[PDB]
Structures are given as C-alpha cells and as structure tokens.
C-alpha cells in the first residue's frame, strides 16, 4: 500500500525533508 | 559499593582465548571464567576496552548496568579492574543483530523485525526508567538471545545522571549513530538514545545497511541541518517510516519518547505482514 518507488531498488543516500522546520535548523 | 552488587574479579579467573573482536574503544575477547574454585567452569566474552576517574562513571555504569532484571539488557555479568578495564557478560552465539540480519536478509520476516524493535524499544525504556544514558546503541551492540528474544549492550559509554541531571556533558561513538546535539553540542540525552534507535530501525530495515555510506562522516552535520535524513526503508510502507524520521526532529523535546515507540510498535507488531514488505 505504501512502499518507496525507487528506479531499480536503487535506495539513495539520503532523503531530504526541507523546507519542514522540524528538520531544518535555525543556521 | 560494598562486598554485594557488582562482582570485581581477580584477574586469574578468567583466560582470554581467541579474540572475538576489536572495535573502536577496545578489543573484546571470549574466553572463560573459572570463579576462583568454584569448580564451575563458564565461557563469556571479555570486554578490554582501553581510554582517569572518567572510571566512576565506567563503574556507576557497571553499578546500575548489572541492577537489571529485564530480558532486554545483557546484564553485566562482571568486571576486571587492572591498568587497564575489562567487562564480562554472559556470553552470545549468534552475535550482533547486525550480523544476524545481514546473514538472514532474505529469511526474516516482519514478524521478528517489527518485535525486535519493540523488544529494543522496551530496553531502551528500563534504562531511561533508571536515570541512565545508553550514548551508543546501535544493530551491533545489540546481541541475540533468540530471534525471537534479542538483547543490548555495553561498552561503559553510557553514564546514571544524578537526581538533578537532564543532558550528559562530554572512543568517540560513530558520528552517523547520534543526534545533532550530540554531534555539534557534545550532548547526551535519554532523547538523543531515540534519535539513535533511528537508525537502528533503519539498519534492520535495510538489513543492516550502513547508514549514509558513500558520504563522509563529516557532513552528516552538514545535512543533518539541511534537514537530510535515512533513505526511506524499500520494505517500509510510509506508515513505519514516520515514526523513524519523527526521532530525527530538530527539537529534542519534540520527538517519540520510549514507552510510546512500543506502543506504536507494540501495535504495527500486531500486524507485522501490514507495514513492512518482504518477500519470504
């Protein structure tokens, strides 16, 4: 139901979750 | 203190044998422990790590680290005290679950992962129920009791706050493992554990994949303000996920606590084939 999509299993380094505050620090 | 509670041993009823392992603070062995007479012959693996009265801690670690009657945390069988630390514990097979889920990638099931997490997540709580600061936990000082009972260990990093502590002030615990406090403030907080149990989950997740690997562990900071976080877990429906990228806030006070990581996990773990996805 609610899986990753990624082109070949290919599983990247990072996932990014800006601009969300609650992960990007006051800098 | 006292003659009760913390067993010291005299450094003859024990033999370091082969070494099991080396790691950054210290190469820990396997051999056995004679208790000096006591017929009774016992086989563990000894932990000589190597680093003042930074040793209070190591022994108010120890002093609390053996007080436990939980089966999620490898009690600390005993210690050795020469110019030089050692710690015993009763011994694994297996090993560390990273091993495990890295000889076992396609065998396990979501059964077992969902568990384990709660089954980390309960111990992590013991310890933080007892004013206690793991610092370092990670697939690999975690051990295996059973796959269907794992537990966790340590390497004296943690440290028991006293009454009027809130963060621990501060080997060198892998950067990739801890919060941002811990890395650009060295703090150390029964939240930043959370943060760490993160990625723990990611790993089994993965299967133990290495966390970040292909970029330095120096950016970790450099992204982890750029409000970068783990890839998402392929066998993770968005569901799990969440409560993953939660322990990873900016703001400490704002993420998962422990006895709530089992409660959402205690729960998912009720329908394990729900939110993970794997074949066989």
Request: glycine share 6%; proline share 6%.
């Given at each position: ?10 599983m ?7 601009p ?8 | ?80 005290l ?53 610092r ?14 794992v ?46 149990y ?26 982890l ?31 998962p ?24």
């Open positions: 139901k609610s899986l990753p999509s990624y082109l070949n299993g290919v990247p380094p990072t996932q990014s979750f800006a969300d505050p609650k992960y990007v620090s006051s800098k | 203190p006292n003659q009760a509670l913390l067993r010291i041993l005299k450094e003859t009823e024990f033999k370091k044998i082969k070494v099991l392992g080396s790691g950054a603070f210290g190469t820990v062995y396997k051999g056995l422990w004679i208790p000096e007479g006591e017929k009774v012959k016992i086989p563990v693996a000894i932990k000589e790590l190597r680093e003042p009265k930074a040793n209070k801690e190591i022994l108010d670690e120890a002093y609390v680290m053996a007080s436990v009657d939980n089966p999620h945390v490898c009690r600390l069988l005993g210690i050795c020469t110019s030089t630390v050692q710690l015993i514990t009763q011994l694994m097979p297996f090993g560390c679950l990273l091993d495990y889920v890295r000889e076992h990638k396609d065998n396990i099931g979501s059964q077992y992962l969902l568990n384990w997490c709660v089954q980390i997540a309960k111990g992590m709580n013991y310890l933080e129920d007892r004013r206690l600061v793991h370092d936990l990670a697939a690999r000082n975690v051990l295996v009791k059973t796959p269907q009972h537990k966790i260990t340590d390497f004296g990093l943690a440290k028991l706050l006293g009454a009027e502590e809130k963060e621990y002030h501060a080997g060198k615990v892998p950067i990739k493992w801890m919060a941002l406090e811990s890395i650009l403030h060295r703090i150390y907080t029964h939240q930043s554990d959370v943060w760490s993160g990625v723990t989950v990611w790993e089994l997740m993965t299967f133990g994949s290495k966390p970040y690997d292909g970029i330095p562990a120096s950016e970790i900071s450099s992204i303000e750029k409000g970068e976080r783990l890839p998402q877990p392929p066998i993770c429906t968005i569901d799990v996920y969440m409560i993953m990228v939660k322990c990873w806030m900016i703001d400490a006070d704002s993420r606590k422990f006895r709530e990581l089992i409660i959402e996990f205690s729960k998912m773990a009720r329908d394990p084939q729900r939110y993970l996805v794997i074949q066989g």
